[PDB]
Amino acid sequence: KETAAAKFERQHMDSSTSAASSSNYCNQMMKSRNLTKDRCKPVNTFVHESLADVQAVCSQKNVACKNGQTNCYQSYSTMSITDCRETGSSKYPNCAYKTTQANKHIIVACEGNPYVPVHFDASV
Numbered sequence: 001k002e003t004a005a006a007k008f009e010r011q012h013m014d015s016s017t018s019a020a021s022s023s024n025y026c027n028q029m030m031k032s033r034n035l036t037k038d039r040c041k042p043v044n045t046f047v048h049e050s051l052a053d054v055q056a057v058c059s060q061k062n063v064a065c066k067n068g069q070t071n072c073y074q075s076y077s078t079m080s081i082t083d084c085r086e087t088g089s090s091k092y093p094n095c096a097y098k099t100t101q102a103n104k105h106i107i108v109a110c111e112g113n114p115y116v117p118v119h120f121d122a123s124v
Protein backbone atom coordinates (compact mmCIF):
# COMPACT_ATOMS: atom_id res chain seq x y z
CA LYS A 1 0.00 0.00 0.00
CA GLU A 2 1.10 3.63 0.69
CA THR A 3 3.62 3.37 3.63
CA ALA A 4 3.11 5.34 6.89
CA ALA A 5 6.23 7.42 6.00
CA ALA A 6 4.82 8.13 2.48
CA LYS A 7 1.40 9.15 3.92
CA PHE A 8 3.15 11.59 6.26
CA GLU A 9 5.00 13.18 3.28
CA ARG A 10 1.71 13.31 1.24
CA GLN A 11 -0.34 14.95 4.06
CA HIS A 12 2.33 17.12 5.77
CA MET A 13 5.45 18.00 3.66
CA ASP A 14 5.55 21.01 1.34
CA SER A 15 9.26 22.00 0.93
CA SER A 16 8.46 23.82 -2.42
CA THR A 17 8.08 27.26 -0.72
CA SER A 18 9.28 28.90 2.60
CA ALA A 19 5.59 29.75 3.46
CA ALA A 20 2.03 29.99 1.99
CA SER A 21 2.02 33.11 -0.31
CA SER A 22 -1.84 33.40 -0.57
CA SER A 23 -5.23 32.71 1.16
CA ASN A 24 -5.99 30.06 -1.56
CA TYR A 25 -2.96 27.92 -0.42
CA CYS A 26 -5.04 25.36 1.64
CA ASN A 27 -7.84 25.03 -1.00
CA GLN A 28 -5.15 24.26 -3.64
CA MET A 29 -2.85 22.00 -1.50
CA MET A 30 -5.65 20.00 0.29
CA LYS A 31 -6.97 19.09 -3.21
CA SER A 32 -3.47 18.27 -4.61
CA ARG A 33 -2.75 15.83 -1.70
CA ASN A 34 -6.08 13.90 -2.24
CA LEU A 35 -7.46 15.28 1.10
CA THR A 36 -10.73 16.51 -0.69
CA LYS A 37 -11.34 13.37 -2.86
CA ASP A 38 -14.27 11.63 -0.97
CA ARG A 39 -14.82 14.20 1.86
CA CYS A 40 -13.19 17.47 3.04
CA LYS A 41 -10.38 16.50 5.50
CA PRO A 42 -11.23 19.04 8.25
CA VAL A 43 -7.75 19.86 9.74
CA ASN A 44 -4.26 19.49 8.28
CA THR A 45 -0.77 21.03 8.82
CA PHE A 46 1.84 21.49 6.05
CA VAL A 47 5.55 21.92 7.01
CA HIS A 48 7.67 24.20 4.73
CA GLU A 49 11.12 22.90 5.70
CA SER A 50 13.35 20.45 3.79
CA LEU A 51 12.57 16.68 4.22
CA ALA A 52 16.05 16.32 5.83
CA ASP A 53 15.24 19.04 8.47
CA VAL A 54 11.87 17.37 9.30
CA GLN A 55 13.39 13.79 9.38
CA ALA A 56 16.05 15.26 11.74
CA VAL A 57 13.28 15.97 14.32
CA CYS A 58 13.39 12.14 15.07
CA SER A 59 16.81 12.85 16.83
CA GLN A 60 15.59 15.94 18.85
CA LYS A 61 13.36 16.23 21.98
CA ASN A 62 11.73 12.86 22.85
CA VAL A 63 8.21 13.45 24.25
CA ALA A 64 4.98 11.47 24.85
CA CYS A 65 2.54 11.19 21.92
CA LYS A 66 -1.14 12.24 22.39
CA ASN A 67 -1.92 8.45 22.27
CA GLY A 68 0.53 7.58 25.14
CA GLN A 69 3.32 6.07 22.95
CA THR A 70 6.87 7.42 23.64
CA ASN A 71 8.12 7.59 19.97
CA CYS A 72 7.17 11.30 19.59
CA TYR A 73 9.71 14.08 19.06
CA GLN A 74 9.44 17.85 19.36
CA SER A 75 11.56 20.02 17.00
CA TYR A 76 14.13 22.03 18.97
CA SER A 77 13.65 24.93 16.48
CA THR A 78 10.44 26.57 15.22
CA MET A 79 9.50 25.58 11.67
CA SER A 80 7.55 27.38 8.91
CA ILE A 81 4.07 25.67 8.86
CA THR A 82 0.59 26.35 7.38
CA ASP A 83 -2.52 25.26 9.38
CA CYS A 84 -5.46 24.35 7.07
CA ARG A 85 -8.92 24.31 8.71
CA GLU A 86 -12.21 23.78 6.89
CA THR A 87 -14.60 26.77 7.28
CA GLY A 88 -17.91 26.37 9.19
CA SER A 89 -19.84 26.90 5.87
CA SER A 90 -17.57 24.53 3.77
CA LYS A 91 -19.67 21.86 1.97
CA TYR A 92 -18.20 18.86 0.03
CA PRO A 93 -17.49 18.85 -2.86
CA ASN A 94 -16.67 22.62 -2.66
CA CYS A 95 -14.19 22.15 0.28
CA ALA A 96 -13.22 25.58 1.72
CA TYR A 97 -10.21 26.18 4.06
CA LYS A 98 -8.77 29.06 6.10
CA THR A 99 -4.96 29.28 5.64
CA THR A 100 -2.88 30.31 8.75
CA GLN A 101 0.95 30.68 8.35
CA ALA A 102 3.00 30.33 11.57
CA ASN A 103 6.51 29.53 12.91
CA LYS A 104 5.99 26.84 15.61
CA HIS A 105 7.72 23.71 16.99
CA ILE A 106 6.36 20.47 15.44
CA ILE A 107 5.71 17.17 17.26
CA VAL A 108 5.92 14.01 15.11
CA ALA A 109 5.83 10.26 15.83
CA CYS A 110 8.85 8.44 14.31
CA GLU A 111 9.09 4.79 13.27
CA GLY A 112 10.89 2.43 10.91
CA ASN A 113 14.21 2.16 9.05
CA PRO A 114 15.06 4.74 8.10
CA TYR A 115 13.61 6.25 11.35
CA VAL A 116 11.31 9.00 10.00
CA PRO A 117 8.04 10.80 10.82
CA VAL A 118 4.84 8.71 10.41
CA HIS A 119 2.30 10.96 12.23
CA PHE A 120 1.88 14.73 12.85
CA ASP A 121 0.91 14.97 16.60
CA ALA A 122 0.73 18.79 17.08
CA SER A 123 2.49 22.18 16.65
CA VAL A 124 3.40 24.28 19.76
Ligand SMILES: [Rh+3]
Residues within 6 Å of the ligand: 118, 119, 120
Ligand atom coordinates in the same frame (compact mmCIF):
# COMPACT_ATOMS: atom_id res chain seq x y z
RH1 LIG B 1 -1.51 9.32 12.09
Ligand SMILES: [Rh+3]
Residues within 6 Å of the ligand: 119
Ligand atom coordinates in the same frame (compact mmCIF):
# COMPACT_ATOMS: atom_id res chain seq x y z
RH1 LIG C 1 -2.49 7.84 10.38
